[model samples]
Target: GSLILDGDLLKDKLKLPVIDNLFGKELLDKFQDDIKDKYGVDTKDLKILKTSEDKRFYYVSVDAGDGEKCKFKIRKDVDVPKMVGRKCRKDDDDDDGY
Candidate 1:
């Protein structure tokens, strides 16, 4: 006996393993729907880098090689010092106000 399957069906079947390996069952179930709602269901290349420390905090790179970019970081602390100086008016002359 011989069997034949449509190309679309075969492609979808092949993607099953990739999806399963990349995301957890719960995440996989909602992945497409969430993407559709947020990004409008357009097919595009995406890369993900998983960290051993936290699966939920994986890095996702979309539209690889494109000039646009995105990034994220987790830090314990951050600081920005305030600049203190005399307020100068438009009429103020150039002077070494030390």
Candidate 2:
């Protein structure tokens, strides 16, 4: 509550977090554990606002009034496939679709 993290929170060029990595449940548990052990923060209050055009991290932001203290990013390793295999359309050169 002492720290004022309002207005223009992030800067350009990835003022990156130590990459809360967000790999999986195992990793997530580790992160929460680390914060509790290291920073003494109760991760039950953990929340974040991470996003992805790729199916990776989950979004977390608390309305705890403290306004999302801490942060949790659950990685969705569940199949995120937008990939469609294409066979040569034929008659189109090496560039198919032509």
Candidate 3:
């Protein structure tokens, strides 16, 4: 089965801690290890801020971490596809509006 990921949902789905701590070397290494152990690969697509309007808010870019040339545009408010075949709340209910 293939996994489909929605770039926007990742932030909420993964529920990662603060960015300052998340990007630390030790944390990144741990992340790499976790990914390899759980997903069987160290390759990941990360979304990083490129520009900012409010110092607190910024744009982001997604890139492949395996030295690959793959890169993707992750736009704000955009439902970029992340994971496919993943269970969504809608999946459990065939009725409209829970």
Candidate 4:
């Protein structure tokens, strides 16, 4: 005439999978805007290059005119643009060499 119960069996059954980084049109737009905001340049002709096909990060190249070219990488998950490191020096392109 006794009851003995000292355990819980309903506290380890919660596993949800959340898929992020959908990468929609809005996301792309945001990427462009952010790029300009952070790098102070426009992405009219974005040059995207990568290693493999299933790469999550994207390589972007931007030309800020005046012989100033910049490159960076973008990740959908984080959406942070990183600089690829470039410094162009315009020498004889100042005047119209005709």
Among all candidates shown, the one with the greatest TM-score = 4
Better of 1 and 3 by TM-score: 1
TM-score of 1: 0.25
List candidate 4 stretches off by more than 4 Å. Answer: 1-30, 45-54, 78-98
Error of 4 at 28 (Å): 6.8
Off by over 4 Å in 2: 1-27, 51-98
Ranking by TM-score: 4, 2, 1, 3
Q: After superposition, how far is residue 63 of candidate 3 from its true place, in Å?
A: 1.9
- lDDT (Cα, 0-100) at 70 in candidate 1: 20
Which candidate tops lDDT? 4
Please report, as a residue range, the 10-residue window in candidate 3 with the lowest summed lDDT. 82-91
**Higher-TM-score candidate among 3 and 4?**
4
What is the per-residue lDDT of model 1 for residues 1-98, given as tens digits with 9 covering 90 to 100?
00112111232222222233144222212343444454343323333222111121212223323433221111101121111111122234364231
Question: Model 4 over residues 22-44: C-alpha lDDT tens digits?
Answer: 32222334555665665565455
- Give Cα-based local distance difference scores for all models: 0.25, 0.31, 0.28, 0.33
RMSD of 3: 13.6
| Clash count, predicted structure 3 | 8
Model 2's C-alpha root-mean-square deviation from the true structure amounts to 18.4
Ranking by lDDT: 4, 2, 3, 1
